[PDB]
Structure formats: structure tokens, C-alpha cells
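lol so apparently i was supposed to do this last week
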Amino acid sequence: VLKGINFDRSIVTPENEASILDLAMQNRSGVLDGMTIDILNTTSNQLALFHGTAVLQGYGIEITRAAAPDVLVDTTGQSNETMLLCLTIDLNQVNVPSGTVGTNTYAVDYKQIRLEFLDVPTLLKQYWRDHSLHDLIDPRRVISMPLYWITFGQTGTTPKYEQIKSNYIDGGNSGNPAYGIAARCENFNHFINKVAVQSIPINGVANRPVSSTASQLTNYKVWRNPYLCSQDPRDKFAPDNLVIEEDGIYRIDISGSINIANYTFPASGNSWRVGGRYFQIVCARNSSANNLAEFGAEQHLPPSGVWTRRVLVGEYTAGMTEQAFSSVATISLFKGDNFFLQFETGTNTSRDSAYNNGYGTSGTHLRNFSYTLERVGDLNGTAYYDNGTF
Amino acid sequence: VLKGINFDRSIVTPENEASILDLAMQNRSGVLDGMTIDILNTTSNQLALFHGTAVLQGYGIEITRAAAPDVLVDTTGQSNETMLLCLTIDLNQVNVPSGTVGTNTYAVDYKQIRLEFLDVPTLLKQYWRDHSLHDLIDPRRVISMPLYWITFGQTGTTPKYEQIKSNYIDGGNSGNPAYGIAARCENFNHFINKVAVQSIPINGVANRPVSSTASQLTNYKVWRNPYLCSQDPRDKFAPDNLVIEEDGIYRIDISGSINIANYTFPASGNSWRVGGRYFQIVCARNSSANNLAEFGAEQHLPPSGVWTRRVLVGEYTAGMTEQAFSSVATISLFKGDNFFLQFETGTNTSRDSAYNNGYGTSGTHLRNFSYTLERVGDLNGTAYYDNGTF
Amino acid sequence: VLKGINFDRSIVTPENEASILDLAMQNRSGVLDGMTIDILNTTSNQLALFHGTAVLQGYGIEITRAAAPDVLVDTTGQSNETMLLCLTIDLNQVNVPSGTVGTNTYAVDYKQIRLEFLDVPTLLKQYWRDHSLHDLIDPRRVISMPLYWITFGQTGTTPKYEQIKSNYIDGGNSGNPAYGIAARCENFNHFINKVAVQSIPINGVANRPVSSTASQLTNYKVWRNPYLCSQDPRDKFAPDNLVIEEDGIYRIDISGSINIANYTFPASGNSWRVGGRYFQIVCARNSSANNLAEFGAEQHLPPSGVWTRRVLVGEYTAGMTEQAFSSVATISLFKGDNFFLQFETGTNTSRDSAYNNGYGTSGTHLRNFSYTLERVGDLNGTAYYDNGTF
Ligand SMILES: CC(=O)N[C@H]1[C@@H](OP(=O)(O)O)O[C@H](CO)[C@@H](O)[C@@H]1O
Ligand SMILES: CC(=O)N[C@H]1[C@@H](OP(=O)(O)O)O[C@H](CO)[C@@H](O)[C@@H]1O
Ligand SMILES: CC(=O)N[C@H]1[C@@H](OP(=O)(O)O)O[C@H](CO)[C@@H](O)[C@@H]1O
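anyway here it is w/ GN1 bound
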């Protein structure tokens, strides 16, 4: 029949108020505060966390302070192994209340909640980002959130640790936790190499023109939201490519200029006209490598006919020393995709190349270049096919 | 007096937890999953829906599975008529509980919830998008959400159906359900007609240059969010105009280039200078036609002094074969408005026109053109006057 | 131990359902409707408000109608003084229930909620925007929201009032209450003064070219969200500078054109080439003045190494009468900062200036200029250092 959830005679359940908080977190789970590692209280038998709060598919979970040490996890038996420390909800277990309201002695042993060590394959089979307690088709009884990589050494030693920042809602994004900026940078300058096609390094090192003959690799400020993207884990592609961690429609903004742009000088032989040189700036996706996403997870396969290159700026050099550009596009991207930006032009510098024959600040370069990448829509349901191919 | 809602001694009601979930849906109602038509179980007496879940002004409503057929609606008496199948909340009715908690036999006949057929005028008088159970000034006791157009034939036949996608939260938008992208497209190329003022077709067919003498009508990928906009229902305007379905401040992004742009060649008679030709790209709203919104609903009237044309790009051709452009603006739009984009230039090709005398790829055209339209703000309360005129 | 909040055996508290609604308001508090001043019922003894509803760190508060006058606040004793009328939650007090459910006589005197007059320093020490009932480190028991400046005259007179619009969720922003547009304007034209560095007036008065010899100060439409920004309160800077009221990552969009742009004409002495003139449009932040934010609150100090100027457009004039530009950037801004936009160029009009020697419509000017500033991210937690310096 038609059932109301929420109406005057309805009873409201645990499962209901959880389904509602999930909705309010934009279906993101994570640590809302604390639950970082407390290394002072961390022996070779035991691993300690600080207090705090997390939401996992709508279920609120707390580690309370008392007495530090806020909570302890048994590590005895773990040795020479990298594991994930995970917070897990297991709805097969029974929570055990004791005592009574009306005294003030009501308390619960929440056996449905545990902190545990999992290997990567086990965590992936029950990872909140891919499976749900509330799922329509394959609903689960157990679901986990990974918090730290824990690499155990020798028995007797205390382990090494690396926070899983994608599962902490830190900062960046309280208010719109599943959306917002994915990556952004400050203005930088980058030397254009003498080739037809090259990537623009978006991951925080540019080849900056520094003198009339040389450029040098120079850090610039960049930020990424680790829930949404990461730097490519292969060094070959690390300067240039992002790995997308979450499916969506994304907005890419770019702006900058091309400085010391090439062009054909007015001779009398061309009727005293500037001969412009064609260039374009494109964004690109590529899903040919699997398992680039966090944990080596399986990539999400894009719909048939999906785009791979899109022109953001396409024009001729105009005969000026410096020429500015800007562009904004929305584009579909998928978990596991590489995303990057390319500069393309001809390679004959006396006929068709936007770049000249100089080096450093005498050679053609991007100046004042910056971008922002932002997640602005999801690709659930029919959007996957209607919106996901471009 | 001062009443707390939520405080230690407060009692929390149905009406309260509903007012709170509404808030969490950004005041959007709709189907959250399922509740599509189940045509296998659908006779000439009866219409069947699949299970699922919806929220209607904060009230959660469920069709449960058991035993398919997940629920049935009596169609007997309906004949040669187009109706709306609607989910309706009627707070004048009594929900009837039976049995007891503490047994496990508590159950409710929710007479406050029904599936029914309404005609368009009746649905409009009680449509959630225009009236509210929670309204300050005119609060209602009955409110509906339309799910399908149902066109009944002859007695004996089974009816035809069309989903009302604006009332399903499918995909596109889980997380920001009342906002997000309204329309977007992939890059396309469009021939510029030899006239002073023309619309740029934004609804998925362009006149693409294909040869040195001809262009041809060619589909390009486009997507629209049917909650926010639709293609104009008049064929005259269907290639070019959107109908806005929801009031708001919207962001319009455009980018592209003008290719084979015209200009006056350096002769000795102009002192060997390029004579640029003025053009502009404008966005436009027009509310002169009423009842373009879904269901023929009444348009929302804009504040006095409202804008109708805004220049996004205004400059001269620069003497290059191809010249790129980009622009981002925020603009007010109202339910029932037409929105479109125009290219404007002079019509004397030897003096003031940005376009030349060629056709197809020899004639002046937009290349790599794309847009995104996004709802970014509402126009409730004082914003209607302070923000709504531009 | 591990505590569940929300699970089958959990008890859900006041404090819990409040922490959850806060989350759903994006941690913004404010008036959701009504609670404006009711001056008809407002004597020299007493101040009257209309009914309505507010949320204060997750606690819902109501003034009910009955019988107008919807509620009264005692003003006796207040004289020749500007005060803040504030809604305050005081969790040290006891709410006093009376009567019984099962009769229909249950009622509560909510002594935890009061309307009161505070001076500015007292309000600031307990202002919801800077302190929280839920705070991790310094949790409070009392918290306030200011609603009106109330300036009391002579005993016998009734007071003057000014609404605190930052604390009313009016309009603009229902759905994304802590984010969305901060400021926006319609297209305007502004004369470029003959100086190296000048601000572009963004606060609704431009110096519009009106004739071949003159410009004139002319209003244009602008809007600001008073939760996020305000016009600078110092007249010296009021045409040009915003004060940021809320920390965040913001997006700035600009577009427009430079009209009657200067350049060096092709003589035979430069080999018949256009000599372009460099200009740039920059956005700027400055935190050197403290206490510009609402109420004279303390500015939030930016991380060490924070940006102060960023180039949005940097290029040469191209020899055309009018040249368009556009740019989009994300930038960090802090409570108390000034934000403004600058046009920079050389000052020798026969060599390096983008501007010429004319005035009014004969002189170089911005045309069709507009902007939008939007809050798109927060700077809580680690984002303050990782994202906040640029
Ligand atoms: C299997 C593999 O490593 N492919 C690389 C390679 O793609 P191909 O489609 O194989 O060219 O170059 C891409 C960048 O150009 C990178 O994104 C990708 O992961
Ligand atoms: C009554 C009517 O059909 N008006 C049309 C017509 O507007 P007028 O203001 O009537 O020119 O042209 C518009 C597009 O240019 C279209 O938006 C509109 O609906
Ligand atoms: C103490 C003071 O008033 N400083 C002014 C002044 O900054 P200085 O850093 O002091 O130049 O000019 C700024 C605008 O250029 C304005 O933002 C600021 O408030």
C-alpha cells in the first residue's frame, strides 16, 4: 500500500532518521571531527585514536573523551603488513542496552560499530563509496569507511601511518560536502616546448621562464580536494594529470595569456598583413588505464560515445606581444579517469606555429595561467546516458 | 510567547520533522526512486506502479514491494481523456492505525495519501510548486505532485503514458536538487546568416558548415534539467528558445570563436590599417507570451524595470581568420520566460558587417560554441525587487 | 567507547536533533521568516515584533500569532542609547513544562530563550558567528543573534530602528544559505582616469561617458548579500571596496571591454605595425584596517604568505577600437578584508598607455563591464593553510 514515513500516526525508526541525515550530508560519509591518530598512547600492542564524530551512511558515530586515551584498537598479531584501519557498521550484530531510563543508568554496548583492520580487497568489497546499507538493488548489512593506512613493522615496534584524507570532512567543503572545488591554483608562467602537442602542468610545478635564455622548474600553489581528485600516482604523468575519484559533471575554468606569441610579420610580400598562427587549448579525459583511483578501485566505465577532447580556446595569434584568453566549460568525468589540459599548435615556426625560436623569457610562454575545476552535478540514474557523454 | 521547537522539553511532531526534511530537500518535492509505471501489470481497469519513495513538502511517502504488482490505481470510468496521475497529500483525512506496538502488529491505513487522476486545472490549483501545506499566507490542506500524463482511449484499451520528469529527482542533481545545471551542450559550429540580428540555436540542432559552399542542419549533444527549463513548445521558436520553469538568478557561461570573420583589408586608402567590424553576442529574456511553462501554468511576473537584453560580448573583429570569446554573467529569470542568445552585427559587408559574403566553411560562422546555464540563487522575499530586475 | 547516535537502541536528544538541523542549515543561523518589527504596537515602554520562525545553531525558535501584538519586549529603563535587540539561547536556564499530554494541556515556559537588549561588546562575546553551543574547544552555554539596531531617544519617545539583514535569511539564498552570490551588478560603462593604477567602482556608481567631452556619475544596479559582504563604511573607499563578512574561497567573474583603446599607429617609422599598449585588470585584497566587518568585529587573520593582488587579465591593446575580455578566478578572502578591482597601465600616452588623451566618449573607457562574486568554499580546518594563501 501507500505508506507514510513521517505522518501523524507513523513511527520513526533509527533506519529512517539515518536515511534522513545521509540525505543532509549529500550522501557523503566521513569523519566530521577528530578521530585522528593519537601516537602518544600508541604502543606495539595497541593503536589509539582521539575523540570525535563521523557519519556513515546516515549513522552518527562517536568516540567520547574521558578520565585520553580516548579509544584503543588491538593490534596484537599484526606484523609486517600494510592494512587499513576502518570504521565499520555491521547491522547483523545486536546492540546491548543495560540499565534504565528513569534511573539515570541507560547505556549501550554498540556491537554494530567497530574499529578494525582490513586488507584492501576486503575494504573495497564493503566500502561505503561503492555499496550501501540503503541500496535499492544490492543492500548491504556491513559497510566500512577507511581512516588510515597502517603499516605494521616487526613485533615490538609501533606502526607507521597515513591518513586517508578523502574520508575526513576537514575543511574546504562543510556545507556542500559532495561537491565544490576539486582543484585550483595560483597564476603561474610556463614555457611552451617546441612540439605540436603538450600538456600544461596543473599539479603545482611549472617550467617558469626566468632569464632571456632559460626556464626553470618552480613550484606554484595548488590545492586539491582528495575526495574528488588526486595527482596521478605514475611519475611519468604526475606533473600533468589528475585522477578523478568521483563521477560527475565538472566545470573547468581557465584563464591566462600567451606571451611572445609568434606571427608572420607584415612584409610587402604578404601585402603588409599580420599572418596569425592557429593554436588551441583543450581539456582531455582518458580512461584507458584501470585502477588509478584510490585503493586501486575499479574505474567507472563511461557511456558509449563519451568525449575525450574538448576545445576550450581555439584562435589565431593576433600580432600582439601578449594575448589573453579565458574559457569555462562543463564536462563529464568518471572515477578512475585521467584529466589534463593540452596546448596544441603547428611546428613550423616560419609558417604555422604559435611559438617562436627563443628560450626562457625570449620564447613563447603561458603567463598568468590558472584554473579551477569544480564538481557541479552528479551522473546517477538517467543522467549517466543523457549528460555523461559530454 | 517564545516557543522552542527542538529544545529539551519540546515535543517533536510529524509536521515538525516534515518541515525539517523539506528544508533538507531545498524545498523541492519529488520522486526519489522508483514509482515508474509498471505496464506489465496494467490492464484497462487498472494502472500499476513500481515500488519506491517520494518526498512531498517534507512528507515521506512509500510504495512497498510484496508477494509485484507493487500498487494499483483504479481506472474504471476513465475514457477518451488526458488526465494527470498525481500523488496527493490530504491532511483533512484521518490515518487509521490498527493493532499494537508490543505486539508486532501496529499498522496504518494512510488515508492522507492517495494516488488519483486529476485534470490540469485541478492539479494546478493544488500543485506543490505553487502552494504549500506550510505556506505563511495561504496554507493548504491538500497538495499534489503530478507523475504522468495518462491519455485514456476506448473502454477496453490500456492507456498511453508520458512521465513528468520534472517531478522525479532522477539524476543530474542529488545533492542540490533545487539548483545546479539547467542546460548545457557540447561544442558546435553554426553558420551566421546574413542578417543584423539572429538567435543562436541552443536546443541541439545547428546549421553546421560542411563544405566550401554549404551548411547543414546537424544534431549536437545538449542536456536540460526539466525542473528548471524546457525547449520552447512552439515550433517557430523551438530551435532557439528555452522556457524557464523556475524563478531564479542564473549564471550563463558562453565560449566559442568567430571564424572567417570579416574586416576591411589594409589598402593604401585607409593608411594600411585593419578596419574592424563591430559585433555583439547578447542574452535575452522575453515574457510577452503567457502559459509557456509546464502544464500551461501562469507565468511569474517580473518586477517593474526588469532587463530584457544583456551584452555578453561586445567588440570589433581584429583582422584574424579566427577570434575567440568567452563570457560569464548572472541574470534574473522568471517562470514562463523565454531565454535565448543572439548574434548582432551590421549588414553592409564592405563597411560594417562582421560577416562576409561566403557560404558553408567559406562564410563567417561560430565555431567551437558552447554554453552552460545554471541556477545559482533564488528570488524569494526582498531579492525579487533588489536582485530580480537584472 | 564507540557510541552510536542514531542506531536502533540509541536515545535521540534535543541536542542531537539540533546538531542535525544546524548541519542542514550549512551552520548558518538566522530568521527564516517574520520577526520584523511591528511599529504599530510599539510604545515608549515596549517594542513589538511580528510572529515568525528562526533557527539558532540548530534550535528552532517561534514567535506565535494570537488573539497581534505577536510579542512584546520591555524597553522601560532604556534611554539615549543605541543597543542591539537580540534573540538569545541560554542553556543554563530551565524550561518549565506544565500540564499533561493525554490531557491536551502540555505547555512550556521556555526560559532558555529570550529577547533582550545588549550592547555591542556583549553581543560580540556571545555572537553565534564567532562562538557555538556545539564548539569543540570552547563550547558555550549562551549564544545570541542580533536582529535590530535600536536607538533609544528621550523617555516618552518611541525608538528608531535598523534591521540587521545579515541575520535574516530573506531571499537570495534559501537552499544554500551559507554560500551563493556575494555581489553582482548589471553592465556599466566607466571612464578610465589618466593614472597608472585606479580602482573600478563596483558598488553601484560609475563615471559614465555621456558626451564627446564629459562623463558623469551614474547609478547602476548592484546587489550584495549582507551575510557575505558590504560596501566599505569609509566614504573614501565606499565607491570601490567591499568588506568581506565571511571567510571563504570565492569565485570572481568579470567581463567587459576596453573601448577607444590606445595603440601606436602604423607609421613607416615602425615598419607599418600596430604598437600595442600593456594593461591589466587585477583583483586585490587588503587586511591592513581592522574592525571593518559588521559590528566592528575583529578581522580574521589570514595565513602567513597570503596573496594580495592577482592578475585576472593581462594583455596588449590590439589596434581595434574595442576589445573584449573575460576572466574567472577563485581566491581566498577573510572576514574584515577589503576586496576591490584595479585597472593598471602606463601613463605615457604616446608610448606605453592603454588610455588616450580624450574625455567622455572620446576617451578610453570600460564598456559593458560587470562582475559576480560568489562564495564557493570554506576555510575551516586544514584548508585555512592549504587553500587560504591564494
Ligand atoms: C594505459 C595507459 O597508461 N595509458 C596512458 C596513455 O593513454 P593511451 O590511451 O594508452 O595513449 O596516455 C594518457 C595521457 O596522454 C594517460 O592518461 C593514460 O593513462
Ligand atoms: C507573444 C509572443 O509569442 N511573443 C514572442 C515574440 O516576442 P514579442 O515581445 O511579442 O516580440 O518573440 C520572442 C522571441 O523574439 C518570443 O520570446 C515571444 O514569446
Ligand atoms: C589602514 C587603512 O585604512 N588602509 C587602507 C589602505 O591600505 P594600506 O595597506 O594601508 O595602503 O588602502 C586600501 C585600498 O588601497 C584599503 O583597503 C585599506 O583599508
